[PDB]
Amino acid sequence: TQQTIISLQREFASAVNLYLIPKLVLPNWPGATRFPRLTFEMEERNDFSAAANLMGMLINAVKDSEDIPTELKALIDALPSKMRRALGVVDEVREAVRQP
Amino acid sequence: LEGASVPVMSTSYDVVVDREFDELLQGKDGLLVYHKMLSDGTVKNALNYIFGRIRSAKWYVEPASTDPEDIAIAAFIHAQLGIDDASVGKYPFGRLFAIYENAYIYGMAAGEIVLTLGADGKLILDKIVPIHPFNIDEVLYDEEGGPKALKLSGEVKGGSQFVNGLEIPIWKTVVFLHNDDGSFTGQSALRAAVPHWLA
Amino acid sequence: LEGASVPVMSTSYDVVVDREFDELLQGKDGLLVYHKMLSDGTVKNALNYIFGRIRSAKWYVEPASTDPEDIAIAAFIHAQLGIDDASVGKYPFGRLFAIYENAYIYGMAAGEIVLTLGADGKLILDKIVPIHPFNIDEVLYDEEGGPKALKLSGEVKGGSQFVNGLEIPIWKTVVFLHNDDGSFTGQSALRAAVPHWLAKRALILLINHGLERFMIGVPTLTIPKSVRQGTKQWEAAKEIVKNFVQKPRHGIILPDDWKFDTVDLKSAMPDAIPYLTYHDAGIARALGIDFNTVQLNMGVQAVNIGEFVSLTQQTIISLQREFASAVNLYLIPKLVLPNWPGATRFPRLTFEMEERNDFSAAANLMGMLINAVKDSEDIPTELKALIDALPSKMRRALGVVDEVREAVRQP
Amino acid sequence: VGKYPFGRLFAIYENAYIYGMAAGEIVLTLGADGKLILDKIVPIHPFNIDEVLYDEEGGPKALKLSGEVKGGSQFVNGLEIPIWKTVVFLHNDDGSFTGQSALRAAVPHWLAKRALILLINHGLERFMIGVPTLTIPKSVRQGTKQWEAAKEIVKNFVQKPRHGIILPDDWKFDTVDLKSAMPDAIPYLTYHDAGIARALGIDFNTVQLNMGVQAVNIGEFVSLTQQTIISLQREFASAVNLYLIPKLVLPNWPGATRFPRLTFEMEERNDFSAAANLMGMLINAVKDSEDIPTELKALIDALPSKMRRALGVVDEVREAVRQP
C-alpha cells in the first residue's frame, strides 16, 4: 500500500505538472521555459529518540561556545540534507516560496 | 527530423476495443458498474483510506532554479493553487482531488480552468469546476491520433437546461487519467475487482 | 576478421516456433490472453507494485568520465529525458515506462523518437509516442538475421484513418524486449501464469455449479403416468418445484401418491479453497514475487532472515537492469551522435542501489563526527572536509551526495 | 559503444544452463587504434545446432549448424564453424566436452505434476456436481420423444439445477454413489513441486514454497541457494576466462603468457552499525591530529584487506583499471 500510494501521487503530480502549470505560467510569462514543479515530501517514519540523541550531541558540541543560537544554526545547516530533514528543520527555499 | 509521421493508434483488436473486451463494461454501461461498486464496504473503505492519504501528502511547489524569477513564479502558482489549505480563491486544489478521484474510479475525468484577470495585471486562476464522466459522451481527436476537444452533454442542476453536444477545447481544460498507456485512453482502476464483486 | 558470417537464426523447431509451442498462444491470439489476464486481481496487483517500484528507482545519469564535455552531454541528455519529474518537453520519460510495461506484458513494444530542432542548434527530443503491440503486425529483418524495420497497421483514434502496412525503420525508433535471447525475440513475462489462470477460471465455474447443488438441493418429484405435459397437474408440479426453489415457506402439500424428495448426492462438498490458493500461488510464483507483498500469505510461515537479497528484490533489480540496458543501447546513441558525431563513450543511465539501513547508526556516526569537529574552531568547512574524506558507502549512507550529480542536474 | 556484448554472454550462458550446451560467435573488427576491437557477439541457440565435430584425439573440432534466418530469408544448412572463432558454454561438464542440462532431475516431477493436475480436473467434475444416472423401462428406445426428454432431464440436471426433476412413477433418477470422499491431492502436488524446486537447487523460502515447514534456525557456513549461485558464477567465470579472453589478448598481444582474469566480489551481508562503530573509533584516533584527511586515509589503507572491504572503500587497482 505504500508503493500504491506513492505511485498514485506520482501520477497525480505528473498530470498536474503537465496540464495545469503550463496553462498558468505561459499566459503570464511567455518567456518561460522551465516550469516550477509540484512534488510531495518523501515521508519516512523514523524514531524521534534517535533525533533526540543526535540533537543532544549537537548541543554538546555547541556547549563550549559562547553564542549558542547562531553557531547552532551554522551547525544545523552544515548537516547533510537527509539528517536535516530528519530533524524537521526546513530550508529557506520553502519558507521563501510560501510566506512571501 | 520533420515531425511525427506516426499517428497515435487505438488499442483496439477484433474483440478488445479500447482497453476493454467485456461488452458489459464496454461503453458507458461499465460506468454504471463502477458507480455501483461504490456501495461496497471494502471498496469505499479502501478508497477513503487511499484518497485521504493522498490529501495529506505534504505537497510543496518546487521551483526551477535558485533564480528569483523562478522563485517568484513558483510562489505565484503556489498562491494560485493554495497548497496551504484556504485562500480567497475558494480552494481550487481540492477540486483537483475530486477530478482525480473521479478519474481513478471511472478512468477519465476532467475540469475547466477559469482565468479571470486579477487586479495586478496577472491572470488569476479564478475557479475550477469538475466535469463528471457521466456527462462526457465522447472526446474528439486530432488527425495524428492525439486528442482535440471534449464533447459534453449533461443536465444543469435544478432542471434548468439540457446541454447537448457542447464541444470544449483541451487548452481550456485539464484531463486526468489513471494508468494511461501513453495513447490517451484511461482504463479505470476498479477493473479487476468487478468479477469478485459479482460473485 | 572480416565480419559476422553467421546469421541470427530463429528459435524455431518443428513444434516450437518463435519461443512458443502452444497454438493458442502462437500468434496475436496470445496477445488476447495476455490482455485478458489484466482483469485478474493478483496479476494487476503484482504489476502495479512492480511498475510503481520501477517508477521510484531514483535514476541518475552517469557520465562517461570527469571531463567537462562528458558532463556537458550528460546534463544535455538529462534535460532531454527529464529525470526530475516535469519539464517543457511534456514528460517523455514516463512514455518509456509505458512502452516498457507494454513490452513486459506482451513481449515486444516500441515507440517513436521525434527530433525537432531546438533554438540553440541542438536536436531537442520533442516527443515520444508509444506503439502498442496490437497494432504491430510483423517486424522486418536484415539478411543477416538482425531486424530491419517495423511493419505497422492500426487505427487512428476517432475513426479517422485505417493505417495499413506502414513500414518504419529502426533508427527512428526504440524497441523494448523482455528476457530476449540475444536473437531479437521477446517472450512475454506472463507466459507461465497462463495455465494456472485458466484452471482458476474453470475452478471458479465449478464452484458456482457446485454451490447451487449443495446449498439449496435439487428437487425431484415422482408422479403417476396419468399426468402428462401441459395439464393442470403438470402446471401444479411446476408450481411446487418453483416454490421449493424460490419461496421456501409456502410449504409442500401433496396427494398420497407423489413423493417429493431432494436428490441425495450422498457426499459433502469437497473443500476447493486449497486448490484456489494453489493456482493463485502458481500465478504469483510465475510472476516472481513473494507472498507477503501481494496479499497471499495464508497460514504459511514468515521469512526468518532471508538470503542476501529477497525474491521480489532481485526481480525488481533485474527488471530495472533490463530497462536501463535497453535505454542505454537504443535511445542514447540516437540522441548523442546526431548532436556530437565525435562521441565514443556515451553517458549511462543507472539507478541508485538502495539499502534500507538504520538511521540511528548514521546518527551515532554523525555524533562521533561532530565530536571530532568539536575541538576545532571553524565547524562547517572542516566538517565537510571530514565528510568528503569518508569512504563512498558511508558517505552514501549519510545521505550527502557528491558534486557530480548536483553539477549534472542543477546546471 | 560496443552494443553491450556482456549480456549476450549471459544469454548464451542461460541457454547453456537450460539446454546443456550453447555457443556464440566472436566478431573481431579492426579498431582505429590498430587494436582488434570486439565488435559484437551473436548467440547461437541449441535448437539450430545439429552436431559438433570432433578431433581424432576426442576433443572437439568444429560446430555444425543448420537453422533458419529470421524473416524466412535463408534456410542455412550444414554450416560448419571452427571453435577458435567461437565460445562454448557448458553446464556441469565432465571434462570430456559433454554438457548435461541442469533441468534433468526436474523432468519426472514435472510430468507427474501435469498428470496429477489432469487427475484433479477429472475428479472435481465427479465430486462437485455428481454424475447423474437414470433408469427407464425397455419400451423407450433411442431417438424417441421419451429419449429426448431423458436427455433434457440429464442436461438440465447438469446445466440448470433449478428447474427440478419431474418423473413418472417408473423412472429412478439417481447420482452414482462413489461411496468415498475425494482424497486430498494437495500434499502430492506440494511433493512434486518440492521435487522440482529441490532438483533446481534452491531453498523453499526464496521461491514461495515454504508451506508449514520450519524456517532455518542458523543455517550452515553457507546456504543452499548461496552455494548454488556461487558455483554457477564460478563456472561462468571459468568458461569466460578459458575461451573468450585468450581469443582477445593473443591476437593483440602475442607475447602474453598470464591472462587477466574475471572474478566477482565475494559478497557478505554484514552490519553497517559495526562498520559505523569502527569508523567512529578511527576518527577518534584521527581526532588529535591536525590534518584529518590524509592521515585518515593512511589509517584506512593501513587496515587489513577484509575490514577495508567491509568499510566499502576500494583499492586503487580497480579504479585504475576502470576509469582510465
Author numbering:
A (entry chain A): 337 to 436
B (entry chain A): 26 to 224
C (entry chain A): 26 to 436
D (entry chain A): 113 to 436
Show me the paper's own sentences about this structure.
During assembly, these viruses translocate their genomic double-stranded DNA through a portal protein that occupies a single vertex of an icosahedral capsid. To gain knowledge about the structure of the dynamic DNA tunnel, we utilised a thermostable bacteriophage, P23-45. The portal protein oligomer is a ring of 12 subunits, with each subunit folded into Crown, Wing, Stem, Clip, and Tunnel loop domains. Structural information about the portal protein is important not only for deducing the mechanism of capsid assembly, but also for understanding molecular events associated with genome translocation into preformed capsids, and genome ejection during infection.
The in situ structure of the portal protein within the procapsid was determined by localised reconstruction of portal-containing vertices to a resolution of 3.7 Å by averaging around the 12-fold symmetric axis. The in situ structure of the portal protein differs from the crystal structure globally, in changes in domain positions, and locally, in conformational changes such as the inversion of the tunnel loop. In the in situ structure, the C-terminal Crown domain (residues 377–436) is shifted upwards away from the main body by ∼5 Å, and twisted by ∼13° around the central axis. The Wing domain pivots ∼8° downwards, towards the Clip. The tunnel diameter at its most constricted part is wider by ∼8 Å. Hydrophobic residues V325 and I330 are no longer exposed to the tunnel as they are in the crystal structure and are replaced by polar residues Q326 and N329 due to inversion in the tunnel loop conformation. Residues 330–335, which protrude into the tunnel and are part of the longest helix in the crystal structure, instead adopt an extended loop conformation in situ, facilitating the tunnel loop remodelling. These modifications alter the shape and surface properties of the tunnel, which widens and changes from hydrophobic to hydrophilic (compare Figure 2E,F). Movement of the Crown creates space between the Wing and Crown, which allows remodelling of tunnel loops, facilitated by an unfolding of a 5-residue segment of the long helix (residues 331–335) within the Wing domain. The unique conformation of the portal in situ demonstrates that the capsid plays a role determining portal conformation, allowing DNA to pass through the tunnel, whilst the portal has the ability to modulate packaging activity and slippage by switching its tunnel properties so that it can engage and disengage with DNA.
